[PDB]
Amino acid sequence: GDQRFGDLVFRQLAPNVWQHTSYLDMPGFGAVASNGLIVRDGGRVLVVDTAWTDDQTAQILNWIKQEINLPVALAVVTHAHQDKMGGMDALHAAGIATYANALSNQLAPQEGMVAAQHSLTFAANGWVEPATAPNFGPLKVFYPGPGHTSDNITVGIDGTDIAFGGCLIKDSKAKSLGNLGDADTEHYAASARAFGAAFPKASMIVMSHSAPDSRAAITHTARMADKLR
Ligand SMILES: O=c1cc(CP(=O)(O)O)c2ccccc2[nH]1
Ligand SMILES: [Zn+2]
Numbered sequence: 001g002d003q004r005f006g007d008l009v010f011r012q013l014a015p016n017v018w019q020h021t022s023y024l025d026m027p028g029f030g031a032v033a034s035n036g037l038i039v040r041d042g043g044r045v046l047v048v049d050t051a052w053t054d055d056q057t058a059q060i061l062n063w064i065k066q067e068i069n070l071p072v073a074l075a076v077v078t079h080a081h082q083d084k085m086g087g088m089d090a091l092h093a094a095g096i097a098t099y100a101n102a103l104s105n106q107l108a109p110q111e112g113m114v115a116a117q118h119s120l121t122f123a124a125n126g127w128v129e130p131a132t133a134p135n136f137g138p139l140k141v142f143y144p145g146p147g148h149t150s151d152n153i154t155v156g157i158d159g160t161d162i163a164f165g166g167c168l169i170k171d172s173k174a175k176s177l178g179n180l181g182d183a184d185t186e187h188y189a190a191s192a193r194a195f196g197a198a199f200p201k202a203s204m205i206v207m208s209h210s211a212p213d214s215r216a217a218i219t220h221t222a223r224m225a226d227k228l229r
């Protein structure tokens, strides 16, 4: 199932959906896997999250060229940490239009990230304002509230059973909520549940640091986040 391609791993999740995985040594934590998504929408490709680095992200584009061979129309990145935005320059060098939460673009410089070219804004209920996400095809972008970070966003794939929680969601057997350095501990639990409610028919929950899981990832993450209050 898993395909090793250079130093990255690619796994098909649905007929038009693949998970990309890249690795970075985090001293004190080993070599940490980070996952994003690749979606074919007709004659174009859409990317969710970069890899940790520019070189790794260029390798994602190389894999897309070889395995799909269609242009990458856009990428959306899910918050201003290295695992999700560290390869922005590689997307820009390739001429790909890039999108992030407005707050992610505001935070990017101080986080050592390069901002995306376009800013998403969100209605009061969390759904992306559609004018800020033109041509997103099946990607349904939802801001669930502050959690892993204040800017974390999530993405469902219309026409599939897949929703992507990024670093907000941990797996059903996870022991901790991971890096809380930029987290909103008061609101995390409600934000995790809001993600689940936004994508009620998603049976495959994809996330940053574990293999895809059932919706028990959502209930378990929220139940762990209850303890932070
Ligand atoms: O400061 C950090 C930031 C990250 C990236 P994150 O996953 O929070 O987006 C991290 C990831 C794994 C282990 C430790 C870490 N420390
Ligand atoms: Zn993060």
Ligand SMILES: [Zn+2]
Pocket (backbone or CB within 6 Å): 083, 167, 178, 208, 209
């Ligand atoms: Zn993470």
